[PDB]
Amino acid sequence: GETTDGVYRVMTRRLLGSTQVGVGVMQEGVFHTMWHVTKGAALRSGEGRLDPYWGDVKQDLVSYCGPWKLDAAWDGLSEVQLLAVPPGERAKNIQTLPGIFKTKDGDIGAVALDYPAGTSGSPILDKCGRVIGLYGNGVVIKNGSYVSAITQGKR
């Protein structure tokens, strides 16, 4: 009920209105987002509370209610879609051919798409609609342009 599959905004509020700090994915009863979005704070979902279950600052990932479930991988060849959920805007799909981050721990697909801070955690999809990673941990090249890793956890 409070964990139905889908993409969700992560919001904060106090005694006034709400601000979107990120996005995440509900799959198999587990909520998935980036560590920098929530810092491991508990999340309200309707009348219920979701508590962090697993997370890792270096990977910049966190899961709630259970272990990380998303395991689809970019195939290194195909176009992908960012299902961007920008603050104040409807969810939208943006198709792109990833580049790569070449790292000492392997190649990571990387999308040269620039969306605001609160879009962090938006899912990146393969052609079957599976989530191959989350958007929003990236680099900035010399001219200022942004490139995000396709950040995926381990199931």
Place this chain on the structure above:
Amino acid sequence: VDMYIERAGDITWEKDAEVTGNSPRLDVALDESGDFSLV
């Protein structure tokens, strides 16, 4: 702070998707803080 979630959509690939962005090959390092940088 009330941090909460609200539905934004169903997770699907959209065949009518705008295609954009380049495809860079970048040498990158990841530090223990979770920050990527260019090598």
Place this chain on the structure above:
Amino acid sequence: KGXXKK
């Protein structure tokens, strides 16, 4: 980006 690279 825009909280830096996040």
